[PDB]
Amino acid sequence: LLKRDPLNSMMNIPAVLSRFAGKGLLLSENGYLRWYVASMSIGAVVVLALLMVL
Amino acid sequence: MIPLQHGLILAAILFVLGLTGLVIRRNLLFMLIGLEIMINASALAFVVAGSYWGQTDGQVMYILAISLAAAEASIGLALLLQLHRRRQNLNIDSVSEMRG
Amino acid sequence: MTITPQNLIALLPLLIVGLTVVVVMLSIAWRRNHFLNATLSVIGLNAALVSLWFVGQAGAMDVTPLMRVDGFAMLYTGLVLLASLATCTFAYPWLEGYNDNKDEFYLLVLIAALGGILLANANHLASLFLGIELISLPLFGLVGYAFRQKRSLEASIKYTILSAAASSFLLFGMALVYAQSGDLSFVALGKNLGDGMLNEPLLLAGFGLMIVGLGFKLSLVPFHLWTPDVYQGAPAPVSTFLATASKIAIFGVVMRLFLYAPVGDSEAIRVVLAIIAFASIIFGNLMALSQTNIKRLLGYSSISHLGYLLVALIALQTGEMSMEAVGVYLAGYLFSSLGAFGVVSLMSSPYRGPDADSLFSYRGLFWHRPILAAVMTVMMLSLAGIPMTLGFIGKFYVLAVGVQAHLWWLVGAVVVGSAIGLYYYLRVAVSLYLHAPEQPSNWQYSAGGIVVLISALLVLVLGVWPQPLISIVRLAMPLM
Amino acid sequence: MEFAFYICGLIAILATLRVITHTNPVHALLYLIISLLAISGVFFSLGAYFAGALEIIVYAGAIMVLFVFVVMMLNLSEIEQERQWLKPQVWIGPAILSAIMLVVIVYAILGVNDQGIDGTPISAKAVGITLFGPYVLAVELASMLLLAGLVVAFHVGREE
Amino acid sequence: STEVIAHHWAFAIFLIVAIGLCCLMLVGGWFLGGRALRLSAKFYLVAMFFVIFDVEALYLFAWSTSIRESGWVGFVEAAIFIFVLLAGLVYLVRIGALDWTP
Ligand SMILES: CCCCCCCCCCCCCCCCCC(=O)OC[C@H](COP(=O)(O)OCCN)OC(=O)CCCCCCCCCCCCCCCCC
Ligand SMILES: CCCCCCCCCCCCCCCCCCCC
Ligand SMILES: CCCCCCCCCCCCCCCCCCCC
């Protein structure tokens, strides 16, 4: 049961999570200029709302 | 007896209208038009702020704003001319090759 | 106010770079000579760099209601001038293969360096705005200098549109800030507020819009999506300048703004900047995990390193060594990025036509370019924060500043992002030292090689012995 | 002076709304010129006489002239045959985002101290005094910025 | 004041009567009477040069109305501004940017 070294895989789980998160984040880099402007305006909305709340 | 709030509200309305025109339009010419609207709205906001405080600083910043606006309009229209010369269309979604 | 001759002495790099712009202009008007115009540009930049000594002997005080010249401004002017000189040195062999006019490149580099000096000496919202535009618009020209190439034109269009949008956002922010405070000087932003009413809604909104513009300019999340595309599409010396000098000057003027403005101590702005720094570090490291191309990898690297810088900036009001940390980190980041982008520029030079690919192919570089591979792997170890390198000294400074101010979320972010950076930087290094299936001769190419070699030597020497850099950064202390 | 300010602001808002929703580029530029004239009227109502004069002279007399020149150059072409921006699946999202940002900015505006803009006319003499006084380097480096834009636009906008 | 509001009303009446005159002229013209290529980039270049030098002209417009109040140092500053303007103009002439002929 232990010959696959389960603790090694459990500690390799963060590497898999980092790979999945990087692949998910790279979907934002689609290369569309209109999406870049939209993301800048979305970030402006988020920054303004966070400053208004706090 | 003209409120500063009303002038800033008008400038904000024009700014978000220019931003909406910049986002929703795929034509690069309308994107440049929207950019001109946003920078003119920011310059109007500076003029309103300078007129509220009775200072010439708002008009000085307006002058700097329109110097920037003229120069970026020139650069953006040259880029638009090159894009129309080498692509024969102004669809900004077509130029999306580098990604990821 | 009036301008004294001592004020003109304190404005010596500005006047020298502007006179160099005029002289290079008239030399191009006389006769298009690539070598003579490049020589005049580098002579003017070196003259400004050595006139920094006369600026230091002048003193530290207020040249304008707009500029304040202090040791901070001297250090940032020196970093900007060094980056511009390295950009010209890398640009000459790349422009040797350029078939259109080559002389406009150095004029644009000179105007961008002038904007960097403006941002270094800026003490006013007008100066901040004009310095940002004076940096960005020559960058509009330089990013699409090879506009016949499809990727360079695409990067120019993206950078121009997004930077005009960010300039409008920033300008609206200064408009709201001026409507609140009534003064455009840095020291008078939120000065009229009192009794714990520092979080004025209009002032916070204007500072938020300025944060949007500057966070575009600093490649901070979520205004970061332009960075790998513009870095990849631009020419490699342009990518060198855009990675080093623009980031350094804009972060220096942001440091001045948050140091001088009483509203820089606001809790809400601090939390917003902490969120931006956390997301910037994590996102910039995560997106560079699977990047085959070196330019996009360096763009995500720039995002993460600016996140570390932002972490150092958040503790500006808490620790007095935050300016020390920012200066040491920026010197290390400047030299590492100069080395990496100079290796890319030297292996991308001369410009092999607009219709051909500009792919790097760093695999097996040691077996035909051993010194370039050694410099490039030194820079990749330096950007990872590995000891014996100056990037480690900067990251140690960032960690010390975060620990002193109890920014534990940011400290954990730096550790996690450092591990992810270790992965992809070591991947680049071993790919350099692997084997490749398949795949100069002038003194300017050798000059670029010398520049990247002294950059690597500086990184190693100041990694094992950083105390001279610490002393020269401690000498760069501003007005209180 | 109040009535002129409000009617010019209303005309500018309506003209900008017609600009960002139109199809014909020349018509959009014409409503943009109308909006610039309206914002110049706003400037004149607030006592910023030099700013309104430059708004008609430079913004509505040079920059939009350049836009009109480029539009005539293009002879504008798969634009009116698409009309994609008026389909709601394209424009509802960004309109919602802009409305949210406008609401946040307006809420920040409404919480400020207002003594009212008196509209005292600020002449171009005072603007020229402060332009070559406290803002010397602004003028010089703005000349350099215009030079940078000139060089960049000449380098890009050629034909060879 | 009464004089300034009289001048404001005179200017308003001037504008309204001029607009009404030309509109009524066009209306009378319409009513009366029975019924029965790729341009060269030099246009963009000259318009762009006009825009840039018109902004520089606006800076000189602001300077010219307050020359006495600026003193000799204002003259030196504007001389530097005009020298940079003329260096840019010489640069444009010498590279054939302002030469319409080839
Ligand atoms: C994935 C890897 C990265 C992991 C994340 C990065 C590190 C996270 C560290 C979290 C620290 C949480 C601290 C919680 C309490 C903070 C507020 C407080 O009460 O602080 C106490 C004290 C300040 O109050 P003072 O009056 O100065 O008292 C002097 C104390 N002798 O505070 C002090 O004097 C200084 C307190 C310092 C506490 C230790 C910080 C570093 C500890 C080692 C690393 C974290 C633990 C090991 C790894 C965990 C799992 C990853
Ligand atoms: C830790 C700080 C940096 C230390 C130096 C890093 C390496 C720099 C380059 C030195 C020369 C490398 C030579 C490698 C030869 C590999 C041969 C492999 C044969 C299979
Ligand atoms: C072919 C590719 C086209 C890409 C077009 C991208 C358009 C982006 C539009 C974004 C709309 C956002 C709407 C609001 C979202 C919720 C509010 C912001 C987040 C809290």
From Swiss-Prot, chain B:
Subcellular compartments: Cell inner membrane
Biological process annotations from GO: ATP synthesis coupled electron transport
Any one Gene Ontology cellular component term annotated for this protein: plasma membrane
GO molecular function, one term: quinone binding
Reactions that this protein is recorded to catalyse: a quinone + NADH + 5 H(+)(in) = a quinol + NAD(+) + 4 H(+)(out)
Keyword NAD tagged: yes
Membrane topology according to the record: Multi-pass membrane protein
Keywords: Cell inner membrane, Cell membrane, Membrane, NAD, Quinone, Translocase, Transmembrane, Transmembrane helix, Transport, Ubiquinone
Predominant location: membrane
Enzyme class label: translocase
Transmembrane segments: 4-24, 28-48, 60-80
Superkingdom as given in the UniProt entry: Bacteria
Pfam families the UniProt entry points to: Oxidored_q2
EC number: 7.1.1.-
Function: NDH-1 shuttles electrons from NADH, via FMN and iron-sulfur (Fe-S) centers, to quinones in the respiratory chain. The immediate electron acceptor for the enzyme in this species is believed to be ubiquinone. Couples the redox reaction to proton translocation (for every two electrons transferred, four hydrogen ions are translocated across the cytoplasmic membrane), and thus conserves the redox energy in a proton gradient.
Record note on quaternary structure: NDH-1 is composed of 13 different subunits. Subunits NuoA, H, J, K, L, M, N constitute the membrane sector of the complex.
Record-stated family: Belongs to the complex I subunit 4L family.
Protein name, entry field: NADH-quinone oxidoreductase subunit K
The organism of origin for this protein: Escherichia coli (strain B / BL21-DE3)
Gene: nuoK
